[PDB]
């Protein structure tokens, strides 16, 4: 089966939102261990992961030079995008307006 | 300064099953992948199995039915079980950290030989 | 799945010489190779990595090549602390598994 991605990722190009309250995050990944699957997850301000709101499932890079496109649906407020796993995690933070 | 440490019995009868230990020093164990690997003079060296904490966890499909892997993080342990312990599974049982972002296993244990004998 | 074939089993050269260590591959799986130096009473330790990346503590007269189906481990100045057994290694994505070739052992002539 899949390993979980254990590498590094990058942003691509900009976080970009859409009609739907949902954000487009696309990484490029930097480790060899591809194919493997995308760690994800929405840390709320309190530094504490939140529950689900990825909207892509079960996102896994294919080739470390395709990059792979993600969308989630951060709550309101602040929050963290994180991609990426442990010590080498992406920390995005993020602000979604209109409460 | 990643360092793992196996211990185990060094005997183990014939049929009866073999628990180690990996304690891990210089990280947690809670991150990345962990693996069991062995070394026989015949046969060289034969991954066993790796997981991640409360996520996954892979097995060699030659020894998936005899092997399981449990995990004590408040001690930085993992172990390893595998039952019915032939001859043959006299080996120096290593565990290792597997890279992240790798494909290679980049810190080992100095390894425990373990003879299969009455 | 794959199968790794490392020749020669036994390399018997003067320091100073070059080595080249070849791990020919059954089917090609990843383009990423690992390389595993073993001395006498000690673990495996990771010598290359990703086919030609040194791993720390690595020296600099150890490089790695390979495209798909076999790899090249090269000693370019060999030394007496050389003597070792070399390993290379691949994971394979379906079944997973890591696998290990028999190794190529190194000995130093004097």
């Known amino acids: 089966s899949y390993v979980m991605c254990t590498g590094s990722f990058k942003l691509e190009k900009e976080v970009a939102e859409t009609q739907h309250g949902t954000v487009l995050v696309q990484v490029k990944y930097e480790g060899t261990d591809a194919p493997c699957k995308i760690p994800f997850s929405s840390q709320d301000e309190k530094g504490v992961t939140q529950n689900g709101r990825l909207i892509t499932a079960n996102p896994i890079v294919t080739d470390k030079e395709k990059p792979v496109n993600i969308e989630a649906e951060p709550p309101f407020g602040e929050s963290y995008i994180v991609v990426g796993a442990g010590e080498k995690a992406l920390k995005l933070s993020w602000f979604k307006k209109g409460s | 300064q990643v360092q793992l440490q196996e211990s185990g019995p060094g005997l183990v009868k014939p049929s009866e099953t073999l628990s180690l230990t990996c304690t891990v020093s210089g990280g947690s164990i809670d991150t990345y992948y962990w693996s069991w690997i062995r070394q026989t003079p015949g046969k060289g060296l034969e991954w066993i199995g790796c997981f991640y904490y409360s996520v996954d966890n892979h097995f060699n499909p030659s020894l998936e039915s005899r092997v399981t892997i449990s995990v004590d993080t408040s001690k930085n342990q993992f172990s390893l079980k595998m039952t019915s312990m032939t001859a043959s599974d006299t080996a120096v049982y290593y565990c290792?950290?597997?890279?992240?972002?790798?494909?290679?296993?980049?810190?080992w244990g100095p390894g425990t030989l373990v003879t299969v004998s009455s | 799945e794959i199968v790794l074939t490392q020749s020669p089993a036994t390399l018997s050269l003067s320091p100073g010489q070059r080595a080249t260590l070849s791990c020919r591959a059954s089917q090609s799986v990843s383009n990423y190779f690992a390389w595993y130096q073993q001395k006498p009473g000690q673990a495996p330790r990771l010598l290359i990595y990703?086919?030609?990346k040194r791993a720390t503590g690595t020296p600099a007269r150890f490089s790695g090549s390979g495209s798909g189906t076999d790899f090249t481990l090269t000693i370019s100045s060999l030394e007496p602390e050389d003597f070792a057994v070399y390993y290379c290694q691949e994971r394979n994505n379906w079944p997973l598994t890591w696998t290990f070739g028999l190794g190529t052992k190194v000995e130093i002539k004097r």
């Open positions: 990703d086919t030609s």
């Open positions: 290792a950290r597997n890279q992240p972002g790798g494909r290679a296993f980049d810190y």
